[PDB]
Design a protein around this ligand. Structure first.
Ligand SMILES: CO[C@H]1O[C@H](COS(=O)(=O)O)[C@@H](O[C@@H]2O[C@@H](C(=O)O)[C@@H](O[C@H]3O[C@H](COS(=O)(=O)O)[C@@H](O[C@@H]4O[C@H](C(=O)O)[C@@H](O[C@H]5O[C@H](COS(=O)(=O)O)[C@@H](OC)[C@H](OC)[C@H]5OS(=O)(=O)O)[C@H](OC)[C@H]4OC)[C@H](OS(=O)(=O)O)[C@H]3OS(=O)(=O)O)[C@H](OC)[C@H]2OS(=O)(=O)O)[C@H](OS(=O)(=O)O)[C@H]1OS(=O)(=O)O
Ligand SMILES: *[C@@H]1O[C@H](CO)[C@@H](O)[C@H](O)[C@H]1NC(C)=O
Ligand SMILES: *[C@@H]1O[C@H](CO)[C@@H](O)[C@H](O)[C@H]1NC(C)=O
Length: 414
């Protein structure tokens, strides 16, 4: 039956290699743990990423999507490759059983995230495997991915139609993300020696609990660091919201969607202060403190009606975060993928692309993560606009305390 009600002993799926080792009501402790882990990676990754970008740049990702995809990749890992994945993604900072049962509890967390009855806001996810038509993949490997991640294996012809296969993958990702994410894998990323491609997609579309009125939305010039300008449709509202002015005058505002199950957190540093201090001290612990301090208050909310998108490769960051072997054609270990015992597999490169849009009605967001086993290790775009005065955005799920999307909006103009 569905793994949303099953227990580890009901369907004890056997992974390739074994790892070398209050809370909310009606919530299984271990699922809560997984949330802590994923959040511990969310914050950490952002810090490395925000470190490799100009403070006046937009940043937008879905740590959830990245974690899900890499946990999927973890099925075929083994030895030091596996040890690295566990550590980097915080899968080792939890109890023994949960650590040794990641996939199953990820299935459970996901069940809670996307299969929750009576859903006021739309949150859906889709996973998928794309493998070369000529190879013979491990049956158990497929079965477990399909069972736990709902990721079926679609055969594509990378061997002779690499580029065409790429467009196919992207078209699938667009389909799942409502046409928001249409180009996750860059051109020439996939080539003749490509074996498999693991993909995850997350899509959120909710309505504000307290919507904004378009007759109050105005326009004003936004001044960029360089000296230029652009038009920004600044939304206005007045109502009660959980707010809190913290250390050094940093404002924290929460915008709950219909149902309060999911909410948007906005962190605005002091009127003429660097967000850098905030970002550097970003820990799930601090994030929790802020939200715990928020007190429902009456206030005037001003926020731009905008749209941002951010796409990038994950290789550089993850390596600087501990993941080395997985990308090394000499030290990588992925024995549990193809039945042919081809233990020469390595992840060539990984990509991510997110989308964010906000208006008087609500906020839409989509994200994807494409992991390519064997291919073209290219270095994507190294330049994007640097506007000015950015604020941090978080799209979290209240009960599970999970960070769905997270980023920094530096350019609100469109
Ligand atoms: C070194 O020690 C470590 O390893 C050993 C060996 O494990 S091994 O099997 O891998 O070798 C561990 O010992 C095993 O673990 C036990 C455990 O409870 O964790 C036990 O597991 C099995 O039985 C438990 C209890 O079942 S019971 O229902 O009969 O009591 C079971 O856990 C329950 O799962 C429920 C669930 O539905 O998931 C929980 O319900 C709550 O959550 C649901 C929904 O959650 S979610 O949607 O958020 O996901 C909610 O419904 C909406 C409920 O609402 C009513 C919630 O209940 S409420 O009361 O909280 O409101 C139960 O409550 C939390 C929960 O009980 C704790 C477990 O399922 S699992 O947790 O999903 O795995 C089940 O797994 S099984 O498949 O293995 O059976 C094992 O007994 C068989 C036990 O093996 S033993 O017999 O050899 O000891 C060590 O665990 S522990 O330390 O002993 O706890 C482990 O240590 S640690 O990992 O370091 O902590
Ligand atoms: C398939 O993977 C499983 C672990 O999930 C392992 O038991 C088995 O040896 C593998 N079979 C192969 C590579 O043919
Ligand atoms: C995605 O494909 C399904 C059929 O599987 C169809 O219902 C839907 O309209 C498609 N969505 C797109 C192309 O955005």
């Amino acid at each position: 039956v569905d793994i949303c009600t099953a227990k580890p002993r009901d369907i004890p799926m056997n992974p390739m290699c074994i790892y070398r080792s209050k809370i909310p009501e009606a919530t299984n402790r271990r699922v809560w743990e997984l949330s802590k882990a994923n959040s511990r990676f969310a914050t950490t990754f952002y810090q490395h990423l925000a470190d490799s970008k100009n403070d006046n740049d937009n940043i937008f990702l879905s740590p959830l999507s990245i974690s899900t995809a890499f946990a999927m990749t973890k099925l075929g890992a083994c030895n030091d490759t596996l040890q690295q994945l566990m550590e980097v993604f915080k899968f080792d900072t939890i109890s023994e059983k949960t650590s040794d049962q990641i996939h199953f509890f990820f299935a459970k967390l996901n069940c809670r995230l996307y299969r929750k009855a009576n859903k006021s806001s739309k949150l859906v996810s889709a996973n998928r495997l794309f493998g070369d038509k000529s190879l013979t993949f491990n049956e158990t490997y497929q079965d477990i991915s399909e069972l736990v991640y709902g990721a079926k294996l679609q055969p594509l012809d990378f061997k002779e139609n690499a580029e065409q296969s790429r467009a196919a993958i992207n078209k699938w990702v667009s389909n799942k993300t409502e046409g928001r994410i249409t180009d996750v894998i860059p051109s020439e990323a996939i080539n003749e020696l490509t074996v498999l491609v693991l993909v995850n997609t997350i899509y959120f579309k909710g309505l504000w609990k307290s919507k904004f009125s378009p007759e109050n939305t105005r326009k004003e010039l936004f001044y960029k660091a360089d000296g230029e300008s652009c038009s920004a449709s600044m939304m206005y509202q007045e109502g009660k919201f959980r707010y809190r002015r913290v250390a050094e005058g940093t404002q924290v505002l929460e915008l709950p969607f219909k149902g309060d199950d999911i909410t948007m957190v906005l962190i605005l540093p002091k009127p003429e202060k660097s967000l850098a201090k905030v970002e550097k001290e970003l820990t799930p612990e601090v994030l929790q403190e802020w939200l715990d301090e928020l007190e429902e208050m009456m206030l005037v909310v001003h926020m731009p009606r905008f749209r941002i998108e951010d796409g990038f490769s994950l290789k550089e960051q993850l390596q600087d975060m501990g993941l080395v072997d997985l990308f090394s054609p000499e030290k990588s270990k992925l024995p549990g993928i193809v039945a042919e015992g081809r233990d020469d597999l390595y992840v060539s490169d990984a990509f991510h692309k997110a989308f964010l849009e906000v208006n008087e009605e609500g906020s839409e967001a989509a994200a994807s993560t494409a992991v390519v086993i064997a291919g073209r290790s290219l270095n994507p775009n190294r330049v994007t606009f640097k506007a000015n005065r950015p604020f941090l955005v978080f799209i979290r799920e209240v009960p599970l305390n999970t960070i769905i999307f997270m980023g920094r909006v530096a350019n609100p103009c469109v």
